[PDB]
Amino acid sequence: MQQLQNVIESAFERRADITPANVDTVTREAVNQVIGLLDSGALRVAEKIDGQWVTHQWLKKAVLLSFRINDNKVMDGAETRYYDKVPMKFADYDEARFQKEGFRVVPPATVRQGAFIARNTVLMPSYVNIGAYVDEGTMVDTWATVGSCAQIGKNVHLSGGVGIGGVLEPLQANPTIIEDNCFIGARSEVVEGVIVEEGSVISMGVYLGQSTRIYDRETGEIHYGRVPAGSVVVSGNLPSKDGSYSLYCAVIVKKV
Amino acid sequence: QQLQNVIESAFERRADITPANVDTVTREAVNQVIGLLDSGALRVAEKIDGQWVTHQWLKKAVLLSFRINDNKVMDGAETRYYDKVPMKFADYDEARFQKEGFRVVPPATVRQGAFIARNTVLMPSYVNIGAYVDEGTMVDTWATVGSCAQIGKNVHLSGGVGIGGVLEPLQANPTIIEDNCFIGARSEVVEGVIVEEGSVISMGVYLGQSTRIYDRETGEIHYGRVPAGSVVVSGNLPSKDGSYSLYCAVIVKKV
Amino acid sequence: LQNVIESAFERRADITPANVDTVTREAVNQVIGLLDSGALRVAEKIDGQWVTHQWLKKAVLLSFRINDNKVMDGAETRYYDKVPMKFADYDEARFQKEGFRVVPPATVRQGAFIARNTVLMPSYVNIGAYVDEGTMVDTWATVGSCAQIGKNVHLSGGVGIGGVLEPLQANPTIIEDNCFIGARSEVVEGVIVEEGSVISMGVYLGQSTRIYDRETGEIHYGRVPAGSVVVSGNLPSKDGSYSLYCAVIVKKV
């Protein structure tokens, strides 16, 4: 909504002066409502429009505000205790609910309220942060991480130990995006708003950040920030002029 | 073999079986096999005449357990889960723990159907179904022992190490880490690769079926297997025109 | 305290949870509570130099000897270990007073100090560790045994900071103030990352890792000079037939 957006926006500018104590009823109710929409996948931080990914800045503002209006609470672990201000997405789920939503949650996988998980999805022990969106039939392997506002497409395989970087600030920047049917090999990391295009295959040990050189062995071209669809990517190195040493890089070995 | 026949029969008809229609006998057979796997009486792969052999039927049993069981809500304390594979230590008492001989550091988790041997230390980590972890082994923080994987005695699995599970293909052998091997932090060993006894793998080594393993000594290239006593480190091999280089594992010394 | 510990250490083999003497148990318990609260620390900076207090390492090792394994109730599961949970008895007020955050399911062992303004995302902090003010620990990161983490340090996701109990001589892994460690990187075996350094992703630093200074052609071992900007690389073999991993300092801030 609009008044919803207005409320979020005005409050955001006053963020520094807001406390769980002083917050006004309208702000509060506004933020809470937006979080619920993110959680149910009604709204989403980034989306694909006319072949392009666009970010809803105000949605980023709502998530940030949520950190200001909520106070840290003691959370009862069993053998231990926690202390945080973001609630667990499944704290109140029941058998009926789980059945309806159609995904699996293997202990001790944990998800923050404010993240959406689609049907046919399997969460092995892992972590899903607030504002993330995980689409249908995706498999999240052991010890993987889906950071804030991250967008995970359909039929994605995030192998074990895989990290998907979160992106809140700057507000302008798109989150990290993994398109449909992508395969991400174990121990790989995709962060900082890098976009991995549809049907791509990333092998093990591949680290992709905004500064990673993506060498196209075919063209001899270097790309940054994005992995073209159908790419087959592996780790490698690029030599120095004198060849006395070489530096890490990702290589597109083949295009499907 | 009754047990085995029952498993094999059911498998052929997996498609038509459900947690509802499955018959008394099949259910019992499967539960029974899972229990044997859980206690180490049976194992997915074993050494025979010096070579690793895989028992497909055991894989079938595991796969069948997924089909006859239903997802259930599991109460975490702060959260809730929903899965069909029970926890191995849910009914354990002190007596049992004491008898079994290993340590489980919170929040380490193990799925029922996996064998943990005495003198083993599990730091926070995950051990999946059908795995076998032998004596005096150390599993560090955030490591993973995948399905059906075989870990020998006195093995050290450093932090963040992943050992790839292999259910299917049925015929594929699981990932095996032989006795007395050392695996460095952040290494990954997957797809049925076999790491021979007494090997030392350093940090950041990724071994899968297509990983070239370069013997700097002889200049050969091995695949799917690390010969006993090898010291392996991460490296790269150059392109024909030297404009770039690709990832590889290098054998720098054989102890 | 120190004298008792050293004395007890010498007789370590004669000590078990079954017969540990009164004085020895008391002292070890006291020392662990001191580490836990930051009153003592394994390694400290004195006159520009990091010094290791072996007697503290000795105290930790004894704690393991004098204590028995106990069943620990998990909700859906059970555990069996001999080191207690730091936060098991915490209450709101304590958490409030201490001023740090613990995101489920991050876990901390008793004997580890966590300072004010710290944020622990799901991670693990082993015994004897020291985590200074305003540090951020990301998801699936590990702060190993006796490790010293400075103020305003950012430990990225999946980062492992290696523990160092034994050898007793060895100083623990040290991460100075204002350091940034990139995702999936690993610093172990007592390597010292000096203040203000930036480590990119997938960098593995051990005592044997060659830390190549592209500018000077110098190679460091076990230490990252202050203000370094480090990335992964490789050094070619004499012939040029293959190359081997290394860390490269590409610039100094």
Side-chain angles (χ1 to χ4, degrees), chain A residues 4-72 74-99 101-118 120-240 242-253 255-256:
Chain A
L4 212 52
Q5 172 179 356
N6 304 353
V7 166
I8 299 303
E9 292 193 309
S10 324
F12 182 77
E13 294 291 326
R14 327 183 270 104
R15 66 183 176 300
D17 319 315
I18 291 157
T19 71
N22 73 17
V23 78
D24 47 292
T25 276
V26 173
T27 302
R28 174 180 296 122
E29 171 186 345
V31 178
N32 280 162
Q33 194 178 0
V34 160
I35 294 313
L37 298 156
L38 287 174
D39 200 86
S40 54
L43 286 178
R44 46 130 104 221
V45 182
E47 68 181 287
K48 191 169 208 192
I49 274 140
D50 284 6
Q52 311 287 303
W53 284 97
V54 301
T55 303
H56 300 282
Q57 286 181 226
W58 79 278
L59 295 173
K60 278 165 158 210
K61 290 181 178 159
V63 159
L64 286 162
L65 276 173
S66 77
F67 305 148
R68 321 258 354 173
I69 73 170
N70 281 322
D71 219 349
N72 293 306
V74 162
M75 318 190 179
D76 282 283
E79 65 287 0
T80 189
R81 310 210 153 131
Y82 315 98
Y83 194 62
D84 193 34
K85 57 167 109 217
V86 190
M88 304 282 100
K89 175 184 185 66
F90 309 124
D92 295 305
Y93 268 53
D94 65 5
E95 216 180 53
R97 191 137 179 218
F98 273 122
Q99 291 212 28
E101 298 182 12
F103 48 80
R104 271 212 289 145
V105 186
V106 189
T110 307
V111 180
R112 263 172 164 183
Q113 176 186 72
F116 166 75
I117 314 290
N120 304 141
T121 284
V122 182
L123 297 182
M124 289 290 294
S126 56
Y127 197 65
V128 186
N129 218 340
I130 188 174
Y133 186 107
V134 184
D135 217 333
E136 297 188 23
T138 282
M139 156 66 96
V140 185
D141 286 347
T142 317
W143 312 132
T145 307
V146 178
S148 277
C149 313
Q151 306 297 301
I152 314 295
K154 305 189 204 288
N155 307 310
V156 169
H157 192 139
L158 300 176
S159 311
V162 163
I164 302 316
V167 183
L168 269 163
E169 310 205 76
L171 289 196
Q172 210 144 278
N174 71 296
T176 312
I177 317 250
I178 309 304
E179 298 197 335
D180 294 356
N181 309 303
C182 273
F183 166 89
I184 316 285
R187 323 288 131 174
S188 288
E189 188 88 19
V190 193
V191 299
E192 283 159 16
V194 165
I195 308 198
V196 179
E197 292 176 5
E198 174 180 36
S200 297
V201 183
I202 308 267
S203 85
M204 302 195 279
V206 174
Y207 309 106
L208 300 170
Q210 286 291 343
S211 39
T212 312
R213 286 176 304 179
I214 300 171
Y215 181 72
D216 187 339
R217 80 158 181 192
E218 208 178 85
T219 76
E221 282 167 315
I222 302 221
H223 314 229
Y224 286 88
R226 158 195 162 272
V227 173
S231 301
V232 177
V233 184
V234 317
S235 295
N237 271 228
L238 287 172
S240 69
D242 52 51
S244 74
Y245 75 90
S246 76
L247 298 167
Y248 181 85
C249 84
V251 185
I252 291 156
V253 295
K255 299 150 194 209
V256 183

